[PDB]
């Protein structure tokens, strides 16, 4: 039997509650801000999933402020420590174009890759802004910082985008070979 | 109205035919080998999609060996040169775990990240093998090489995995701070 796509939000919700109670507004806000950037939700799915997790006994609410139950804390813990295989490569449509580059002239290839580069540099600039905002905190960064998780997400994103930009630069130099 | 998920294979099929005729066996083989690694197909979808593209006049066959029509070549061209926005970040379940790292002890965090590192180093080794196979060709690599597209896919993958490994190493050193 088919499963509900909204179940993808489960660990994102349980994890959001790991440090204490949040309102539904607080949860939705985390999705619309930091989490939505790497773990997006369809706004329509968040409350339905919250309800499922409540009904399953993973979360409780009072007056609503939601919190993890002992069961929910265990559910989050077991997922965190589980070793999964690494997932299959995510489809990158630009890379499919790159695979078929023989269908483009040198100039068309240069134009395609230049467009991709400018866009990714602009995205990098945005990530750099988010990273500077986080690092504007007083507490220096370390494993023990309450913001370490957020630091992990942002540094991962920054390194990914920097690496993409560097690869594009290298390919543009090949397209523009001496 | 909902669209057919198999349509995701369209440009992969048209592009595979850009250099001349292929059998259905040849196409399926490309999916099961080099393409399937970054542009996977459900084996069940390839022939149905080939049929749709034939019926739409993008591809023709003779006796079957498939080839692009003028329409198909234009369809591929227009897609290649189109500038699209960069897509949203693909969900990386490990990174959601990283975001919630405050729920793990230092040792549990180290164990989680070590597992991910060993797995990604092993994947890197596999990509390195594929890259050496490609580079075992006589023709040196350049924009004009018929294998340039394949080189682009493999180098992109290698750089991505190397960057992931480097980031994991950095985080493990933070978890194991002096």
Observed structural traits:
homodimer; 178 residues; mainly alpha; Arc Repressor Mutant, subunit A; 2 domains; 3-stranded antiparallel sheet; 7 helices; 3 strands; 6% strand; transcription; Transcription factor; dimeric; Transcriptional regulator
Gyration radius over CA of chain A: 21 Å
Largest interface: A-B, 69 and 69 residues
- What percent of residues of chain A are in strands? 5-15%
Number of helices of chain A: 7
Span between N and C termini of chain A?
Answer: 58 Å
Number of strands of chain A: 3
Given helix and strand content, the structural type of chain A is mainly alpha
Widest sheet: strand ordering of chain A: 1-3-2
Shape of chain A: elongated
Quaternary structure: homodimer
Order of helices and strands of chain A: HEHHEEHHHH
Q: Major β-sheet of chain A, in short?
A: 3 strands, antiparallel
- Please estimate the helix content of chain A: 55-70%
Give the tally of structural domains of chain A: 2
Organism (chains A, B): Bacillus spizizenii (strain ATCC 23059 / NRRL B-14472 / W23)
Pfam families (chains A, B): PadR, Vir_act_alpha_C
Domain Transcription regulator PadR N-terminal (chains A, B): 13-77
Domain Transcription regulator PadR C-terminal (chains A, B): 90-175
């Amino acid at each position: 039997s088919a499963k509900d796509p909204m179940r993808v939000l489960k660990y994102a919700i349980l994890g959001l509650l790991r440090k204490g109670e949040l309102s539904g507004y607080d949860i939705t806000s985390y999705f619309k801000e930091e989490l939505g950037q790497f773990w997006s939700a369809k706004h329509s799915q968040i409350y339905p999933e919250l309800k499922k997790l409540t009904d399953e006994g993973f979360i409780t609410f009072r007056t609503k402020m939601y919190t993890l139950t002992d069961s929910g804390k265990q559910e989050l813990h077991d997922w965190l420590i589980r070793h999964q295989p690494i997932p299959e490569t995510v489809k990158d449509e630009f890379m499919l174009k790159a695979y078929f580059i023989s269908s483009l002239s040198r100039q068309e290839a240069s134009d395609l890759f230049t467009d991709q580069l400018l866009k990714r540099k602009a995205k990098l600039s945005d990530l750099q802004g988010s990273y500077e905002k986080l690092m504007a905190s007083a507490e220096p960064m370390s494993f023990s910082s309450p913001d370490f998780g957020h630091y992990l997400v942002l540094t991962k994103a920054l390194e990914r985008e920097k690496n993409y930009v560097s690869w594009l630069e290298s390919i543009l130099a090949m397209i523009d070979e001496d």
